[PDB]
């Protein structure tokens, strides 16, 4: 009940700005028709799990 009160402190005193970097664009000839209409032109290279 002291650690849960401490994780609430760190999220409050946050200060970060996201900067676009590393992004690349693939071609339509080089993607499955399933993985294509899910991508909006340019993905972020360092894609995460989902």
């Amino acid at each position: 009940v002291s650690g849960l009160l401490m994780v609430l402190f760190k999220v409050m005193t946050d200060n970060r700005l996201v900067i676009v970097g590393e992004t690349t664009t693939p071609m339509s000839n080089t993607l499955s028709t399933v993985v294509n209409n899910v991508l909006r032109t340019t993905y972020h290279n360092n894609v995460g799990v989902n």
């Binding site: 676009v20 970097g21 992004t23 690349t24 664009t25 693939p26 071609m27 000839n29 080089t30 340019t42």
Partner: peptide
């Protein structure tokens, strides 16, 4: 430009 694009080999 900061977007290193890519295509196939015959592309």
């Amino acid at each position: 430009k900061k977007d290193k694009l890519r295509a196939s080999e015959a592309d």
